[PDB]
């Protein structure tokens, strides 16, 4: 129960003050006490979790507890807590929730940035709290689709202390050895859902430099840069593990394989050479259907128009991903078995693969 | 005639000063007097409208009139008028026009921004006028084309007090209830003509959230943001009203319909469900042509390669928009009437529609 | 040899001081002396050119020479030399090289920008040198490919005093008369390799305004803009001179021709009208191959799916660039010679050309 709890934290704050050493050393010890308690106790975001009727009962005890700590100490504590300490002593939970609410989406009544920090007035007539640090945004990968033509991924900023439009975002590919880097511009965003089209024709020339490419979201605020590793929060990955995309580069074949890391479950891209006939079989089904089968893993191809090229003939077709390791190319006419063996080239809607 | 006119405005300025109340209250009343007169009288942009020979005759009378108002008052008047008041008293119309000229395109001899405001020196050797506010840009929609694959729109900033390169622009879709938002990056710009390619594959996932999407141009200068509603100034809209684009989304069909609002003639996008066979007929013409007819409104499709898919066969074709509600798909071979009834799938160059 | 050389420069610095005129006029004459010597002598970048063992022998003599010039003068010399003058007197070549190293890629131990200038601490514990100007980046065009559908060019910043991520870049097309302009956004970048996809459908409407379009790279740092003319440093151009791309615009045909200027060997784009049948021949080879031959210059087309349209029939094909002025369209079926003469329309994968 609230005031039985904050009763206790009040007395602990009292004894830190009546310990036996200097004045300013007690507040530093005390300042660390409420950085942690507001970060890791019941107090964090109580105005959004507790239902609205019981929260009046919460702010009284918090108020008497926060009344016990001197106003001096609000300068050494983490900057984003100064408003909550102030409305705690004032037992003002319309504004206390507003603040905790204001941090989640970055919607303040009035605000602006100064020196890369926030100055916020949370409601009309209330003071401005100045110099509030900007914490790292939480990112959830809410979509991830890919084929042999592009990768489409959606990253959703679930929590960020600053609203849409005042920051820039890019998708960052960082090699595991940190030596090489790729940046993909934003394609479109709907509120805080950020969608990136990674065209493999754009990144084919740079991928061979390293095998492991880790995915980050870069978020820039003027010149303060956040590097957010992405993947550990996500919607359910839509493919069987090791599902890959076929890449063709300087007469050689490669696979691009998304996967999730062992230590922290983040998403990365594995790029390595293959031998096409060891990885994918090509067979004739009926007289007008070509079937591509991933032998060890699924390969996803873009659906739509396709063609097969012989040395003196060509046939159009329609490609469809019938299963996660099986692709059907429905040809526009019959192909004899003897000529099927002489396919020189296979094309999807945007890519060509010389056999 | 000029000095008969500015004669009068001089005497009106004289009587505001000889009214009977405090000193600073007269200038505020006076400051509002010339905010309006420069905004809504013959004086606005006279150096660009009047032909060059008669303007010398204008600046003398303006000079004697502006000579009557104290230099004190140039601090409470709208910031962008301070240069014109100064060159008025100086009866300097080479610089007066230069200023009015300088505001139209944002081409100053010397300038830079400070606190989101302009500090301008209009000619060599002349003073710097500091702290000039930036008014909202005028936008004209100079192109708007669309099909079932993308929207291409060109927005031209006809007037803006700051030159190309120092601001950013994005295309904003804002739901009528302000709840949801889409931002499209700039695709290319030629001087102050800004072209946006809105790929429907990029926005298909976000459109179903609301029916009405209003079009804005966002213009950002550091952190000062302008929201400009667009459409009321435009070149002639190139389609018959209610012309739409067909969208396919999770087995369901929709229309995306550009239109212009009743109250202020701005352009918006209407997204709503349809029943394909109630809206579009598909018929065979001759033996090798498929005709799509919009029954209630025209539907625009991307011209170029297309195909029709049957359950065990496929046929390529060429799509052409023969009229605004009629589309022809010229097939590569004949199709029997009995098989035309068994078309399972229809594809344009970039989109697929399962029947 | 080092100290025989810097011996001399020391004495020259001595006599500039013992000349007969004012104090501050000698330092200005002296300040210009070491702007040039560090810019155009053995001293420039010696810590990166000389091999590591012999450089200790270099910094002693430089030290005694730089010891002779007063510390007063480091304020009037070019800002980026202040660290090297300081570590010269200190004969500190671990830090001297670090600085020269730090300028090449823009990798400082600690730094930030202030007023569009750098404040740098080069190693842990060392002072901060403040107010360092940012010189123009060196640009090398490391790739340039094009066809009738897009231009793909890669620009590599070989040297830039500021690391990736803190600046923006755009590709600029500037008409020779400076009247018209085109800006192409960045498509992707890998470290300091910046790739631009210039879609001709995006720039077709703006190209007719002028014939000569010069290529620049714009680099923006807050509001300080660099205009870097590109082309004179490049990898070997991949096409024969005058190789062009065919453009179709309002029933008329044009060529877009990259070329390099006479005076400074920079790359530009020439846009001018042609008569299709005077520039490109179309002939039948065998019964299923259409050959496009550039008569006066090569024309590059995008490889992949293509089609030819007759007034009541259409044929798909595969386009391949067999030589730099010869293109083969391998049709899906035979075409009679009498119907080949009645081709109304020719399509590549993304473009259409009405004959």
mmCIF file of N, CA and C in Angstrom, chain A residues 57-148:
data_model
loop_
_atom_site.group_PDB
_atom_site.id
_atom_site.type_symbol
_atom_site.label_atom_id
_atom_site.label_comp_id
_atom_site.label_asym_id
_atom_site.label_seq_id
_atom_site.Cartn_x
_atom_site.Cartn_y
_atom_site.Cartn_z
ATOM 1 N N UNK A 57 -4.431 8.585 -4.382
ATOM 2 C CA UNK A 57 -3.882 7.941 -3.191
ATOM 3 C C UNK A 57 -2.368 7.771 -3.270
ATOM 4 N N UNK A 58 -1.800 7.771 -4.475
ATOM 5 C CA UNK A 58 -0.362 7.577 -4.627
ATOM 6 C C UNK A 58 0.414 8.869 -4.413
ATOM 7 N N UNK A 59 -0.097 9.987 -4.932
ATOM 8 C CA UNK A 59 0.688 11.212 -4.958
ATOM 9 C C UNK A 59 0.797 11.851 -3.578
ATOM 10 N N UNK A 60 -0.132 11.562 -2.660
ATOM 11 C CA UNK A 60 -0.009 12.104 -1.308
ATOM 12 C C UNK A 60 1.236 11.557 -0.622
ATOM 13 N N UNK A 61 1.382 10.227 -0.608
ATOM 14 C CA UNK A 61 2.522 9.598 0.055
ATOM 15 C C UNK A 61 3.831 9.944 -0.636
ATOM 16 N N UNK A 62 3.854 9.876 -1.969
ATOM 17 C CA UNK A 62 5.000 10.369 -2.724
ATOM 18 C C UNK A 62 5.302 11.817 -2.361
ATOM 19 N N UNK A 63 4.257 12.630 -2.196
ATOM 20 C CA UNK A 63 4.462 14.024 -1.837
ATOM 21 C C UNK A 63 5.157 14.191 -0.500
ATOM 22 N N UNK A 64 4.631 13.538 0.543
ATOM 23 C CA UNK A 64 5.254 13.629 1.861
ATOM 24 C C UNK A 64 6.660 13.042 1.852
ATOM 25 N N UNK A 65 6.885 11.993 1.060
ATOM 26 C CA UNK A 65 8.225 11.432 0.930
ATOM 27 C C UNK A 65 9.153 12.396 0.197
ATOM 28 N N UNK A 66 8.726 12.900 -0.965
ATOM 29 C CA UNK A 66 9.542 13.862 -1.697
ATOM 30 C C UNK A 66 9.634 15.195 -0.955
ATOM 31 N N UNK A 67 8.695 15.482 -0.049
ATOM 32 C CA UNK A 67 8.830 16.670 0.789
ATOM 33 C C UNK A 67 10.039 16.571 1.712
ATOM 34 N N UNK A 68 10.462 15.349 2.046
ATOM 35 C CA UNK A 68 11.551 15.161 2.997
ATOM 36 C C UNK A 68 12.919 15.441 2.391
ATOM 37 N N UNK A 69 13.067 15.317 1.076
ATOM 38 C CA UNK A 69 14.359 15.557 0.439
ATOM 39 C C UNK A 69 14.456 17.036 0.080
ATOM 40 N N UNK A 70 15.594 17.678 0.330
ATOM 41 C CA UNK A 70 15.686 19.125 0.118
ATOM 42 C C UNK A 70 15.582 19.495 -1.352
ATOM 43 N N UNK A 71 15.081 20.708 -1.599
ATOM 44 C CA UNK A 71 15.037 21.242 -2.955
ATOM 45 C C UNK A 71 16.432 21.415 -3.550
ATOM 46 N N UNK A 72 17.467 21.517 -2.705
ATOM 47 C CA UNK A 72 18.852 21.561 -3.170
ATOM 48 C C UNK A 72 19.170 20.418 -4.121
ATOM 49 N N UNK A 73 18.637 19.224 -3.846
ATOM 50 C CA UNK A 73 19.132 18.013 -4.491
ATOM 51 C C UNK A 73 18.638 17.850 -5.925
ATOM 52 N N UNK A 74 17.579 18.556 -6.318
ATOM 53 C CA UNK A 74 17.034 18.447 -7.669
ATOM 54 C C UNK A 74 18.012 18.898 -8.757
ATOM 55 N N UNK A 75 19.190 19.406 -8.395
ATOM 56 C CA UNK A 75 20.175 19.830 -9.383
ATOM 57 C C UNK A 75 21.166 18.730 -9.744
ATOM 58 N N UNK A 76 21.452 17.815 -8.816
ATOM 59 C CA UNK A 76 22.357 16.705 -9.082
ATOM 60 C C UNK A 76 21.647 15.440 -9.555
ATOM 61 N N UNK A 77 20.319 15.380 -9.459
ATOM 62 C CA UNK A 77 19.590 14.209 -9.933
ATOM 63 C C UNK A 77 19.442 14.277 -11.450
ATOM 64 N N UNK A 78 19.110 13.132 -12.048
ATOM 65 C CA UNK A 78 18.898 13.057 -13.491
ATOM 66 C C UNK A 78 17.879 14.097 -13.941
ATOM 67 N N UNK A 79 18.209 14.801 -15.029
ATOM 68 C CA UNK A 79 17.501 16.032 -15.375
ATOM 69 C C UNK A 79 16.009 15.797 -15.592
ATOM 70 N N UNK A 80 15.638 14.652 -16.162
ATOM 71 C CA UNK A 80 14.238 14.428 -16.502
ATOM 72 C C UNK A 80 13.359 14.181 -15.282
ATOM 73 N N UNK A 81 13.937 14.087 -14.084
ATOM 74 C CA UNK A 81 13.157 13.877 -12.873
ATOM 75 C C UNK A 81 12.769 15.173 -12.171
ATOM 76 N N UNK A 82 13.450 16.279 -12.470
ATOM 77 C CA UNK A 82 13.128 17.560 -11.841
ATOM 78 C C UNK A 82 11.650 17.928 -11.913
ATOM 79 N N UNK A 83 10.941 17.766 -13.036
ATOM 80 C CA UNK A 83 9.495 18.042 -13.011
ATOM 81 C C UNK A 83 8.714 17.118 -12.088
ATOM 82 N N UNK A 84 9.085 15.839 -12.002
ATOM 83 C CA UNK A 84 8.318 14.910 -11.178
ATOM 84 C C UNK A 84 8.578 15.129 -9.693
ATOM 85 N N UNK A 85 9.801 15.510 -9.328
ATOM 86 C CA UNK A 85 10.063 15.902 -7.946
ATOM 87 C C UNK A 85 9.264 17.141 -7.571
ATOM 88 N N UNK A 86 9.134 18.087 -8.503
ATOM 89 C CA UNK A 86 8.428 19.331 -8.216
ATOM 90 C C UNK A 86 6.934 19.087 -8.028
ATOM 91 N N UNK A 87 6.300 18.388 -8.972
ATOM 92 C CA UNK A 87 4.884 18.068 -8.824
ATOM 93 C C UNK A 87 4.625 17.036 -7.735
ATOM 94 N N UNK A 88 5.657 16.331 -7.263
ATOM 95 C CA UNK A 88 5.480 15.450 -6.113
ATOM 96 C C UNK A 88 5.251 16.259 -4.843
ATOM 97 N N UNK A 89 6.173 17.176 -4.528
ATOM 98 C CA UNK A 89 5.988 18.047 -3.370
ATOM 99 C C UNK A 89 4.677 18.815 -3.468
ATOM 100 N N UNK A 90 4.302 19.223 -4.677
ATOM 101 C CA UNK A 90 3.049 19.931 -4.895
ATOM 102 C C UNK A 90 1.845 19.001 -4.945
ATOM 103 N N UNK A 91 2.063 17.690 -4.864
ATOM 104 C CA UNK A 91 1.007 16.677 -4.934
ATOM 105 C C UNK A 91 0.014 17.001 -6.047
ATOM 106 N N UNK A 92 0.582 17.215 -7.226
ATOM 107 C CA UNK A 92 -0.129 17.657 -8.421
ATOM 108 C C UNK A 92 -0.033 16.533 -9.445
ATOM 109 N N UNK A 93 -1.065 15.687 -9.505
ATOM 110 C CA UNK A 93 -1.005 14.504 -10.357
ATOM 111 C C UNK A 93 -1.662 14.712 -11.715
ATOM 112 N N UNK A 94 -2.438 15.783 -11.896
ATOM 113 C CA UNK A 94 -2.814 16.171 -13.253
ATOM 114 C C UNK A 94 -1.578 16.548 -14.055
ATOM 115 N N UNK A 95 -0.640 17.251 -13.420
ATOM 116 C CA UNK A 95 0.619 17.606 -14.061
ATOM 117 C C UNK A 95 1.649 16.490 -13.961
ATOM 118 N N UNK A 96 1.642 15.721 -12.868
ATOM 119 C CA UNK A 96 2.573 14.602 -12.753
ATOM 120 C C UNK A 96 2.360 13.601 -13.878
ATOM 121 N N UNK A 97 1.107 13.208 -14.116
ATOM 122 C CA UNK A 97 0.847 12.299 -15.223
ATOM 123 C C UNK A 97 1.176 12.966 -16.550
ATOM 124 N N UNK A 98 0.753 14.224 -16.722
ATOM 125 C CA UNK A 98 1.075 14.971 -17.935
ATOM 126 C C UNK A 98 2.558 14.873 -18.271
ATOM 127 N N UNK A 99 3.428 14.996 -17.263
ATOM 128 C CA UNK A 99 4.868 14.892 -17.502
ATOM 129 C C UNK A 99 5.236 13.488 -17.964
ATOM 130 N N UNK A 100 4.895 12.477 -17.160
ATOM 131 C CA UNK A 100 5.134 11.094 -17.557
ATOM 132 C C UNK A 100 4.468 10.782 -18.888
ATOM 133 N N UNK A 101 3.220 11.231 -19.068
ATOM 134 C CA UNK A 101 2.633 11.201 -20.401
ATOM 135 C C UNK A 101 3.481 11.978 -21.394
ATOM 136 N N UNK A 102 3.918 13.189 -21.046
ATOM 137 C CA UNK A 102 4.646 13.978 -22.042
ATOM 138 C C UNK A 102 5.937 13.299 -22.504
ATOM 139 N N UNK A 103 6.582 12.503 -21.647
ATOM 140 C CA UNK A 103 7.848 11.895 -22.057
ATOM 141 C C UNK A 103 7.646 10.775 -23.074
ATOM 142 N N UNK A 104 6.503 10.071 -23.027
ATOM 143 C CA UNK A 104 6.320 8.868 -23.845
ATOM 144 C C UNK A 104 6.304 9.196 -25.343
ATOM 145 N N UNK A 105 5.548 10.220 -25.760
ATOM 146 C CA UNK A 105 5.461 10.539 -27.186
ATOM 147 C C UNK A 105 6.195 11.816 -27.573
ATOM 148 N N UNK A 106 6.585 12.630 -26.605
ATOM 149 C CA UNK A 106 7.238 13.871 -26.948
ATOM 150 C C UNK A 106 6.248 14.929 -27.385
ATOM 151 N N UNK A 107 5.143 15.026 -26.653
ATOM 152 C CA UNK A 107 4.058 15.975 -26.901
ATOM 153 C C UNK A 107 3.957 16.838 -25.652
ATOM 154 N N UNK A 108 4.523 18.033 -25.734
ATOM 155 C CA UNK A 108 4.502 18.994 -24.649
ATOM 156 C C UNK A 108 3.601 20.160 -25.031
ATOM 157 N N UNK A 109 2.976 20.766 -24.023
ATOM 158 C CA UNK A 109 2.188 21.968 -24.269
ATOM 159 C C UNK A 109 3.038 23.036 -24.946
ATOM 160 N N UNK A 110 4.215 23.309 -24.387
ATOM 161 C CA UNK A 110 5.191 24.216 -24.970
ATOM 162 C C UNK A 110 6.578 23.630 -24.755
ATOM 163 N N UNK A 111 7.463 23.822 -25.730
ATOM 164 C CA UNK A 111 8.829 23.324 -25.618
ATOM 165 C C UNK A 111 9.677 23.931 -26.728
ATOM 166 N N UNK A 112 10.991 23.772 -26.579
ATOM 167 C CA UNK A 112 11.977 23.983 -27.634
ATOM 168 C C UNK A 112 13.301 23.427 -27.124
ATOM 169 N N UNK A 113 14.249 23.238 -28.046
ATOM 170 C CA UNK A 113 15.545 22.658 -27.707
ATOM 171 C C UNK A 113 16.562 23.772 -27.526
ATOM 172 N N UNK A 114 17.486 23.554 -26.591
ATOM 173 C CA UNK A 114 18.582 24.475 -26.311
ATOM 174 C C UNK A 114 19.799 23.642 -25.924
ATOM 175 N N UNK A 115 20.891 23.792 -26.678
ATOM 176 C CA UNK A 115 22.125 23.027 -26.473
ATOM 177 C C UNK A 115 21.888 21.520 -26.557
ATOM 178 N N UNK A 116 20.969 21.088 -27.416
ATOM 179 C CA UNK A 116 20.655 19.674 -27.500
ATOM 180 C C UNK A 116 19.898 19.138 -26.306
ATOM 181 N N UNK A 117 19.171 19.999 -25.596
ATOM 182 C CA UNK A 117 18.398 19.602 -24.431
ATOM 183 C C UNK A 117 17.057 20.319 -24.458
ATOM 184 N N UNK A 118 16.086 19.742 -23.756
ATOM 185 C CA UNK A 118 14.710 20.219 -23.800
ATOM 186 C C UNK A 118 14.429 21.231 -22.698
ATOM 187 N N UNK A 119 13.680 22.275 -23.051
ATOM 188 C CA UNK A 119 13.058 23.183 -22.095
ATOM 189 C C UNK A 119 11.551 23.064 -22.273
ATOM 190 N N UNK A 120 10.858 22.612 -21.228
ATOM 191 C CA UNK A 120 9.474 22.162 -21.347
ATOM 192 C C UNK A 120 8.591 22.907 -20.354
ATOM 193 N N UNK A 121 7.458 23.418 -20.840
ATOM 194 C CA UNK A 121 6.339 23.817 -19.994
ATOM 195 C C UNK A 121 5.201 22.843 -20.268
ATOM 196 N N UNK A 122 4.783 22.105 -19.236
ATOM 197 C CA UNK A 122 3.899 20.967 -19.466
ATOM 198 C C UNK A 122 2.432 21.369 -19.574
ATOM 199 N N UNK A 123 2.034 22.473 -18.948
ATOM 200 C CA UNK A 123 0.663 22.957 -19.036
ATOM 201 C C UNK A 123 0.668 24.477 -19.005
ATOM 202 N N UNK A 124 -0.459 25.060 -19.405
ATOM 203 C CA UNK A 124 -0.562 26.510 -19.485
ATOM 204 C C UNK A 124 -0.429 27.134 -18.102
ATOM 205 N N UNK A 125 0.451 28.130 -17.989
ATOM 206 C CA UNK A 125 0.675 28.830 -16.743
ATOM 207 C C UNK A 125 1.732 28.227 -15.841
ATOM 208 N N UNK A 126 2.166 26.999 -16.108
ATOM 209 C CA UNK A 126 3.148 26.327 -15.276
ATOM 210 C C UNK A 126 4.561 26.768 -15.658
ATOM 211 N N UNK A 127 5.528 26.638 -14.746
ATOM 212 C CA UNK A 127 6.904 27.040 -15.065
ATOM 213 C C UNK A 127 7.502 26.226 -16.204
ATOM 214 N N UNK A 128 8.645 26.710 -16.682
ATOM 215 C CA UNK A 128 9.476 25.996 -17.642
ATOM 216 C C UNK A 128 10.598 25.295 -16.886
ATOM 217 N N UNK A 129 10.669 23.974 -17.017
ATOM 218 C CA UNK A 129 11.819 23.212 -16.552
ATOM 219 C C UNK A 129 12.819 23.100 -17.695
ATOM 220 N N UNK A 130 14.061 23.492 -17.435
ATOM 221 C CA UNK A 130 15.037 23.700 -18.493
ATOM 222 C C UNK A 130 16.183 22.701 -18.384
ATOM 223 N N UNK A 131 16.718 22.311 -19.541
ATOM 224 C CA UNK A 131 17.899 21.471 -19.607
ATOM 225 C C UNK A 131 17.659 19.990 -19.386
ATOM 226 N N UNK A 132 16.632 19.440 -20.023
ATOM 227 C CA UNK A 132 16.255 18.043 -19.832
ATOM 228 C C UNK A 132 16.933 17.194 -20.901
ATOM 229 N N UNK A 133 17.755 16.239 -20.467
ATOM 230 C CA UNK A 133 18.474 15.366 -21.389
ATOM 231 C C UNK A 133 17.498 14.540 -22.228
ATOM 232 N N UNK A 134 17.973 14.089 -23.387
ATOM 233 C CA UNK A 134 17.183 13.265 -24.294
ATOM 234 C C UNK A 134 17.737 11.847 -24.242
ATOM 235 N N UNK A 135 16.929 10.919 -23.729
ATOM 236 C CA UNK A 135 17.308 9.520 -23.621
ATOM 237 C C UNK A 135 17.183 8.823 -24.974
ATOM 238 N N UNK A 136 17.779 7.639 -25.064
ATOM 239 C CA UNK A 136 17.760 6.891 -26.306
ATOM 240 C C UNK A 136 16.345 6.414 -26.618
ATOM 241 N N UNK A 137 15.897 6.513 -27.870
ATOM 242 C CA UNK A 137 14.559 6.023 -28.211
ATOM 243 C C UNK A 137 14.490 4.508 -28.166
ATOM 244 N N UNK A 138 13.326 4.007 -27.784
ATOM 245 C CA UNK A 138 13.027 2.588 -27.917
ATOM 246 C C UNK A 138 12.539 2.307 -29.329
ATOM 247 N N UNK A 139 13.070 1.249 -29.941
ATOM 248 C CA UNK A 139 12.755 0.909 -31.323
ATOM 249 C C UNK A 139 12.198 -0.503 -31.367
ATOM 250 N N UNK A 140 11.104 -0.684 -32.102
ATOM 251 C CA UNK A 140 10.559 -2.007 -32.367
ATOM 252 C C UNK A 140 10.482 -2.204 -33.876
ATOM 253 N N UNK A 141 11.004 -3.331 -34.356
ATOM 254 C CA UNK A 141 10.947 -3.660 -35.779
ATOM 255 C C UNK A 141 9.571 -4.246 -36.059
ATOM 256 N N UNK A 142 8.661 -3.414 -36.571
ATOM 257 C CA UNK A 142 7.274 -3.822 -36.747
ATOM 258 C C UNK A 142 6.992 -4.469 -38.101
ATOM 259 N N UNK A 143 7.921 -4.402 -39.056
ATOM 260 C CA UNK A 143 7.788 -5.157 -40.296
ATOM 261 C C UNK A 143 9.172 -5.482 -40.837
ATOM 262 N N UNK A 144 9.276 -6.627 -41.515
ATOM 263 C CA UNK A 144 10.504 -6.978 -42.228
ATOM 264 C C UNK A 144 10.156 -7.956 -43.342
ATOM 265 N N UNK A 145 10.167 -7.478 -44.589
ATOM 266 C CA UNK A 145 9.966 -8.310 -45.769
ATOM 267 C C UNK A 145 11.143 -8.135 -46.723
ATOM 268 N N UNK A 146 11.418 -9.165 -47.522
ATOM 269 C CA UNK A 146 12.524 -9.070 -48.462
ATOM 270 C C UNK A 146 12.362 -10.109 -49.560
ATOM 271 N N UNK A 147 13.061 -9.859 -50.663
ATOM 272 C CA UNK A 147 13.160 -10.779 -51.786
ATOM 273 C C UNK A 147 14.496 -10.509 -52.472
ATOM 274 N N UNK A 148 14.679 -11.063 -53.672
ATOM 275 C CA UNK A 148 15.926 -10.867 -54.409
ATOM 276 C C UNK A 148 16.066 -9.460 -54.983
#
